[PDB]
Design a protein around this ligand. Structure first.
Ligand SMILES: N=C(N)c1ccc2cccc(Nc3ncccn3)c2c1
Length: 245
């Protein structure tokens, strides 16, 4: 997250920190994710497509720092890693960038909701917020595009939704962005999601309820002028989410 501010997990309790274990024992951060139900985390297929072995992943709920066991956190392994069968990646644009991870503790249980661990509701069919709406994003992604390490403390910021008509303009993304994707950015281009933030939640308050409107997916640069963040539009995928869960 470029700009924004440091935060803790009690402020974004549906946030899942997804890590990968390597031969030799080192563990590294992969992407964020969102808890939609006690047993299911939704993320982005691009985060796992090149290492599609469910046994490699570690998922934490209730965690605020990248390398510290926050009081109240809980750790899980992945019982089922489901990738959309028509995922694909062009030079910039990623398609059907959506994945589901059924989670389970070592004792065989799903998540236990608490003060620092909670689900985030899915959106309804044909009803996303209008362009101009402010939505929040969260992640352990880079703080500056030229950084090579991630911040140790979780961060969050606020950005505004951009219409499909505007995002398809030539200086923005042209016909590369489709109706199955949603754009969002800062009008002053000083804050945004960045690498390391993929798979994380784009949460919008609509009709009074917080909903998982998007999943961090892609973008040219980070907080770069005329290049918004692009997010998987969850409402299009309700038939696929219900079928696979
Ligand atoms: N602009 C986004 N919101 C956004 C969202 C998701 C992204 C994921 C990976 C890489 C990016 N781009 C990137 N460019 C330069 C240095 C590091 N990352 C991204 C950008």
């Amino acid at each position: 997250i470029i700009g924004g501010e440091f935060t803790t997990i009690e402020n974004q309790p549906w946030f899942a920190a997804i890590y990968r274990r390597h031969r030799g024992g080192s563990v590294t951060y992969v992407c964020g994710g969102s808890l939609m139900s006690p047993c299911w985390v939704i993320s982005a297929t691009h985060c796992f497509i090149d290492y599609p072995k469910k046994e490699d992943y570690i998922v934490y709920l209730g965690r605020s720092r990248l390398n510290s066991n926050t009081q109240g956190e809980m750790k899980f392994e992945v019982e089922n890693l489901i990738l959309h069968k028509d995922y694909s990646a062009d030079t910039l644009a990623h398609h059907n960038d959506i994945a589901l991870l059924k989670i389970r503790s070592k004792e065989g249980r799903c998540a236990q909701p608490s003060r620092t661990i909670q689900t985030i509701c899915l959106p309804s069919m044909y009803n996303d917020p209008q362009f101009g709406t402010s939505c929040e994003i969260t992640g352990f992604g880079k703080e500056q595009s030229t950084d090579y390490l991630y911040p140790e403390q979780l961060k969050m910021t606020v950005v505004k939704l951009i219409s499909h008509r505007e995002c398809q303009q030539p200086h923005y993304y042209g016909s590369e962005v489709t109706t199955k994707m949603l754009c969002a950015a800062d009008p002053q281009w000083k804050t945004d999601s960045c690498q390391g933030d993929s798979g994380g939640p784009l949460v919008c308050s609509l009709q009074g309820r917080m909903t998982l409107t998007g999943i961090v997916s892609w973008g040219r640069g980070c907080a770069l002028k005329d290049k918004p963040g692009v997010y998987t539009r969850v409402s299009h995928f309700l038939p696929w989410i219900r079928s696979h869960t």
